[PDB]
Design a binder for this molecule. Structure first.
Ligand SMILES: [Mg+2]
Ligand SMILES: [Mg+2]
Ligand SMILES: [Mg+2]
Ligand SMILES: [Mg+2]
Ligand SMILES: [Mg+2]
Ligand SMILES: [Mg+2]
Ligand SMILES: [Mg+2]
Ligand SMILES: [Mg+2]
Ligand SMILES: [Mg+2]
Ligand SMILES: [Mg+2]
Ligand SMILES: [Mg+2]
Ligand SMILES: [Mg+2]
Ligand SMILES: [Mg+2]
Ligand SMILES: [Mg+2]
Ligand SMILES: [Mg+2]
Ligand SMILES: [Mg+2]
Ligand SMILES: [Mg+2]
Ligand SMILES: [Mg+2]
Lengths: 119, 73, 88, 101
RNA sequence: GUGGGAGAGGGUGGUGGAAUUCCCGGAGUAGCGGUGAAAUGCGCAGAUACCGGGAGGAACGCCGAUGGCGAAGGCAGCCACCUGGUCCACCCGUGACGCUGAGGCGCGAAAGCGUGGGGAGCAAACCGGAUUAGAUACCCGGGUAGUCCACGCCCUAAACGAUGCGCGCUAGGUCUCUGGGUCUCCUGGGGGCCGAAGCUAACGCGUUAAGCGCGCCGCCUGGGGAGUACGGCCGCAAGGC
RNA sequence: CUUUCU
């Protein structure tokens, strides 16, 4: 729609679902996709497969905008993560780079009980 | 397994207390702005201790980072 | 902080004789310095307890010395006080 | 009284006038607090490891000085006021602790 | 005393970056979230994911330890100021000035209480969604007190080494923190492990004694009834001794 | 997932 060629591919992996978002060279989203975006409705949005489908979806949708090169940005430590990274690669888009940038507090907020007990 | 050189071996004399010598201070950081373990900085309980506080000084002055982005993968 | 000089002016001021650093008057003298110095610090920081435990000790260490003095040379004692200001 | 290392980083986009402007100040500030001034170093523009005040660079200052302990904090208080003064870090001066030598 | 030393010891002021939340702008669209699987919930008043700006509270990644400091409770971003303890060297000064300690006074984690302030995140109670035979629970979505600050109070604890304090005496080996020295080692203070002799019901302990001794304090005397009742003292109350 | 009693 507005030719962008190169851009960023943000993978938001996790235990509950993977979701990728292709962006324009400076952060603004071109197109996005997720496990929900596709078929899977619940328990398997996380499955590595779903992650693949999503990543693939995100590509196509984004290649139509003229995309064809991306610096991947990995966030979150879930399943399907490394899988989507491979996906984007097998997709049209050229994976010009890869970077895990999962955020981590230098110790700020008391985590939910679900996440506490660790130290 | 940690079987290479130490940020100390690969280097000579330097002021562990010098918080401005960004040049050599950098050497003591991981692929990320994280302070290396004595395990690999080659330093000692005492030296490693002073480094830690010096690096922390540089960081506030903005000479060294607090955290970096991991490339590759 | 008590400066070296600060301290010296005090020791000489009490030493029973040239070089007298460890006499009971010098001690009670020196301690008394720290005590008053500590008390001032504690008027401000009423919540600094670990320091105050340190105070309690000096005081005890003092009265104990003073006691010894009064038990030996009541004059020196009666004098050491008046000179300082203890028991005030 | 006691030695200190007053570190100061100011806005890397000042015209030579604006620069000497803040310096003439840093100076007075110092003089206002009986801070004598021993050797100094001015590295100026340097590449920060992280954006400070949205700006990716900073003009560095370093004054080794001897001043009254009772007023090292105020020296800082005062110094910080300036908008062009982005960071102030005073430090008690320690001997070096050379390593691997 | 003089000269040196290491430390997350304490109090006050300031200050840094990461993250969460909310708000504002941009870009973007159909879900996000959560689970054993789900649902409650949130999203077209545009959420989730992404970039930028701001606000705020609380906590300080790596260093980090198997480490250090404190009498204990405890104490870790960084800077300054104020202040406690402590170790080594020199043998310089006083000249038994010592040890212990009923009572007293002070300190004392968490929760809790009072007045005021604060409130991002988390979360008793509670409001719901699941599971189940039920589920006043564990799981999931919300959520108030509280958690944070100040000042005052409460004083408990698996407040643990489940080991009172001090001093002297009794093989070594090994690892480590911190000081001194004639520094492939000697010596001093601290932390661990293994072990002589010896001790111990055993397990274990073993120069950091639970060994051999002296001094002082505290405490025990079968279980339940019971840390209850009564009385007294303390506390605003809860409740404490 | 939970998953009592004899
Ligand atoms: Mg002598
Ligand atoms: Mg004599
Ligand atoms: Mg007695
Ligand atoms: Mg308490
Ligand atoms: Mg509390
Ligand atoms: Mg309250
Ligand atoms: Mg909650
Ligand atoms: Mg429920
Ligand atoms: Mg809940
Ligand atoms: Mg040993
Ligand atoms: Mg040596
Ligand atoms: Mg030892
Ligand atoms: Mg030792
Ligand atoms: Mg035996
Ligand atoms: Mg046996
Ligand atoms: Mg043993
Ligand atoms: Mg009975
Ligand atoms: Mg009453």
């Amino acid at each position: 729609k507005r030719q962008v060629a190169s851009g960023r591919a943000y993978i938001h992996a996790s235990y509950n679902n993977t979701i990728v978002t292709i962006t324009d060279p400076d952060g603004n989203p071109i197109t996005w996709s997720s496990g929900g975006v596709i078929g899977y409705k619940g328990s398997r949005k996380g499955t590595p497969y779903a992650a693949q489908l999503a990543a693939l979806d995100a590509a196509k949708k984004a290649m139509a905008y003229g995309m064809q090169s991306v610096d991947v940005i990995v966030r979150g430590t879930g399943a399907g993560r490394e899988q989507a990274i491979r996906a984007l690669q097998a997709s049209g888009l050229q994976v010009k780079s890869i970077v895990d940038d999962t955020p981590v507090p230098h110790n700020g907020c008391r985590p939910k009980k679900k996440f506490r007990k660790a130290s | 397994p940690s079987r290479k050189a130490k940020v100390k071996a690969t280097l000579g004399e330097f002021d562990l207390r010098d918080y401005r010598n960004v040049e050599v201070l950098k050497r003591f950081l991981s692929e990320t702005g994280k302070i290396l373990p004595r395990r690999r900085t080659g330093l000692s309980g005492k030296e490693q201790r002073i480094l830690a506080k010096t690096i922390k000084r540089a960081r506030i002055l903005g000479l060294l980072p607090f955290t970096e982005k991991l490339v590759r993968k | 902080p008590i400066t070296k000089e600060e301290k010296q002016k005090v020791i000489q001021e009490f030493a029973r004789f040239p070089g007298d650093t460890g006499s009971t008057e010098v001690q009670v003298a020196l301690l008394t310095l720290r005590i008053n110095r500590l008390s001032e610090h504690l008027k401000v920081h009423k919540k600094d307890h670990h320091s105050h435990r340190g105070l309690l000790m000096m005081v005890g260490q003092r009265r104990r010395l003073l006691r010894y003095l009064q038990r030996e040379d009541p004059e020196r004692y009666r004098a050491l006080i008046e000179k300082l200001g203890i028991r005030g | 009284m006691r030695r200190y290392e007053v570190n100061i980083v100011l806005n890397p986009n000042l015209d030579q006038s604006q620069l000497a402007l803040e310096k003439e100040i840093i100076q007075r500030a110092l003089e206002n607090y009986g801070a004598r001034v021993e050797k100094v170093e001015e590295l100026g523009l340097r590449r920060l490891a992280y954006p400070i005040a949205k700006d990716p660079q900073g003009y560095f200052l370093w004054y080794q000085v001897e001043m009254p302990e009772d007023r090292v904090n105020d020296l800082a208080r005062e110094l910080r006021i300036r908008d062009n003064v982005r960071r102030v870090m005073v430090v008690k001066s320690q001997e070096p602790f050379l390593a691997n030598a």
